[PDB]
Amino acid sequence: TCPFYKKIPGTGFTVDAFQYGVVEGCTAYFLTHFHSDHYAGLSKHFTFPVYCSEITGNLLKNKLHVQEQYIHPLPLDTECIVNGVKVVLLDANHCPGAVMILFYLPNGTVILHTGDFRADPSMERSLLADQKVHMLYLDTTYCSPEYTFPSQQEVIRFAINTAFEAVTLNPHALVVCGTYSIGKEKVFLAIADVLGSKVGMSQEKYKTLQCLNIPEINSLITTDMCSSLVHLLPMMQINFKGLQSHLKKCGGKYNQILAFRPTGWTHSNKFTRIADVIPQTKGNISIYGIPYSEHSSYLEMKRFVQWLKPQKIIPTVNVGTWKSRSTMEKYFREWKLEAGY
Ligand code: NI
């Protein structure tokens, strides 16, 4: 059954709750972003109102074939009325089209649901600065102090320098980037840009990118693999077997592959810096795991929450075990006692 952490009290609303069939009493289903664990269950046969960003709406239409009449896109940073309740969508700094949702309850309670987010100090100057938030439904993916990672900017700088050096030393080297969802487009676009290439990909993935309102996107991507020296492949194919295989397919246009696997966290984050990363190498093939995160580090999360000073926190990630639940509740209490709310 639909868990309580997916229901907004005092409304008929649910958030990211598309795989339970009809939810008794739901008059509007919100979708924070187009990632499969969140949209799971949506299809062309859905006949309830879906409220979401413009970009998420383009993906629902073109990739899922949900019918236009059930898609209600809203602009960001704008007070909107939905079934008699004032809401605002904010940028979540996750993947394209990902939002946080502010609900203003008839009784005066204000609720923020983060969806998936990477907290950033820039959020402290959005519409959230303007009033008190009583309840926070929080993306707790990396709610533990071992989770440190570098900035996105540092990680992209590393990837750009690595690629540029490799290809300048060997003009017959191929760069490959893995993907399995939207998100992390900066990795492959930043590399393609320093190499004066467009990025080449399958027709399904090109279609997905054409939904995302990226400016000048026609200048940056293509379905013609052979004209491009940055290829995207399914993340499953980023290993020696899948890469050697792939290399054959270019017909000896290339003699070397340099591949990036943008992971979330991996335990080498607890010992090594970005400047000190190394690849796995078998032959003319090298694979870099780079820690490009679209979720809050523990410190970014803690800062956000200590700024917001909510009355109650409802975790939406890692809620399945008593040990995780208990650990998270300890961190929330530390934060509250340190900051004095
Ligand atoms: Ni996500």
What does this structure look like?
The protein is α/β, with parallel strands linked by helices and 341 residues long. It folds into 2 domains: 1-147 and 296-341, 4-Layer Sandwich (Metallo-beta-lactamase, Chain A), CATH 3.60.15; 148-295, Rossmann fold (3-Layer(aba) Sandwich). Helix content is 27%, strand content 22%. It has helices at residues 36-39, 54-62, 152-169, 185-194, 203-210, 217-220, 240-248, 298-308, 322-339, and strands at 7-8, 13-15, 28-30, 50-52, 71-73, 80-82, 85-91, 99-104, 110-113, 135-138, 173-179, 199-200, 221-222, 230-234, 256-263, 280-282, 285-291, 312-315. Strands 13-12-14-11-15-17-16 form a 7-stranded mixed β-sheet, with helices on both faces. Strands 6-7-8-9-10-18 form a 6-stranded mixed β-sheet. It has a 5-stranded mixed β-sheet with strand order 1-2-3-4-5, with helices on one face. Helix 3 runs parallel beside helix 4. Nickel (II) ion is lined by residues 33, 35, 94, 116. Nickel (II) ion binds at residues 33, 35, 94, 116. It is classed as hydrolase. Keywords: PanDDA, XChemExplorer.
Care to give the gist of this entry?
Belongs to the DNA repair metallo-beta-lactamase (DRMBL) family. By secondary structure, this protein is α/β, with parallel strands linked by helices.
